[PDB]
Design a protein around this ligand. Structure first.
Ligand SMILES: C[As](C)(=O)[O-]
Ligand SMILES: C[As](C)(=O)[O-]
Ligand SMILES: C[As](C)(=O)[O-]
Ligand SMILES: C[As](C)(=O)[O-]
Ligand SMILES: [Zn+2]
Ligand SMILES: [Zn+2]
Ligand SMILES: [Zn+2]
Ligand SMILES: [Zn+2]
Lengths: 128, 124, 124, 128
């Protein structure tokens, strides 16, 4: 039940995207230790390199409000296969999430992929 | 003063385990809503996000598109200077005439604007 | 003219499969050495690198630290504007007085400087 | 023999770093289809988010000179375990390199890790 709600939150973010250059929305639902969620949207810039992905938007929102303990991340796109977080997003994930933290990826027609931080970013570069 | 206080109080909440250089931001909408930003570093420095951009990403994620003021604060002898990446995100979302207040330690402030910080801006 | 030609000729070599918006750069050292930059996009747009920054990274990787001119070109009606991220990298490595020539289509040019593009720069 | 030369190139980049903020050098040796190499260095900025990693510096050098076919990447750091490319670097790797392209990571005391693009960035986000 909870996972279905998180998926709906990530999907709803697709209509909150700021993507006037790619027209490629991505949505995220980041779940905290308490179960409160932070929604992420893609936010582009005319200089493409300053674009901020939905996953990172969710982390920056949560971390700015003092969140440091995360239990799940859901990411959605309008894609034939489940949306894949880019490497920059995976690196921010690794800063704040345990390797075992589950990640649910969804795409068109209900396609889903169950994964984890450890699986998305093996041998991760960290403060360590 | 409330906007200055929001930016300064953010300094004690920043995620800066690598620089120990906190930056705070207060982004104000036309409706008067306040969005607070902090800098959020990463073990890979290039993935660090500035306080100004954190505030914009928060506000834009909640549908805000009309901004009337930005305050940026640091623990600096002179009023802190927004970096060029932050200025480019300001230009994406703010009118050139939108005022920007820069703050440092011991009450020092500098009044500026989007137009002055990023002249001949790269745009759409 | 050679510096302008280097920046314009880079436009046909850019890696821009997503924007199809090429940008070229020519970075000149005090010794007269030329470094050419192109923009290099990524499927994740946020990992895109601008032509100006490509030129700086090339030059700095070869030990260059003294820069006397930067030319930036685009296929634009007015002279192309460096984004704020590029301006911040210029400020890392260039004196405020270093001249910057901006170029667009049909011979349009704009003369500027690091100091004018990024006033009150965030620094060391 | 060739791999030892690439490792020396990546190690030599450690003395070409521009890292006045972290004092954490990273070196890279990117090998093209012809065997010509591009050396990468870490290049920091006072605004940390504009820092460019050694791996990406090597790719940007090579790609600016028309290179699009890469056969190996070596990365070096002064680290107890073999240096780990961050996720941003892995994402640029995936733009230009085949999943099977080998990656050699080295650290202090000759420690080495043999890996690949597919292993560093599974289920990679791409143009596809
Ligand atoms: C799937 As993405 C472009 O938000 O890293
Ligand atoms: C003053 As800043 C490092 O947040 O651009
Ligand atoms: C003019 As540009 C997109 O290289 O900063
Ligand atoms: C190991 As690195 C900081 O060059 O991604
Ligand atoms: Zn991403
Ligand atoms: Zn900044
Ligand atoms: Zn730029
Ligand atoms: Zn990296």
């Amino acid at each position: 039940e909870l996972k279905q709600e998180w998926i709906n939150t990530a999907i709803e973010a697709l209509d909150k995207a700021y993507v006037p250059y790619s027209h490629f929305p991505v949505g995220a639902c980041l779940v905290t230790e308490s179960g409160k969620i932070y929604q992420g949207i893609n936010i582009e810039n005319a200089s493409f390199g300053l674009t901020n992905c939905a996953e990172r938007t969710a982390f920056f929102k949560a971390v700015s409000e003092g969140e440091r303990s995360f239990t799940h991340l859901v990411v959605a796109g309008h894609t034939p296969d489940p949306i894949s977080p880019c490497g920059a997003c995976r690196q921010v994930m690794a800063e704040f999430c345990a390797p075992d933290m589950p990640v649910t990826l969804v795409g068109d027609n209900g396609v889903t992929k169950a994964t984890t931080v450890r699986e998305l970013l093996p041998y991760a570069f960290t403060e360590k």
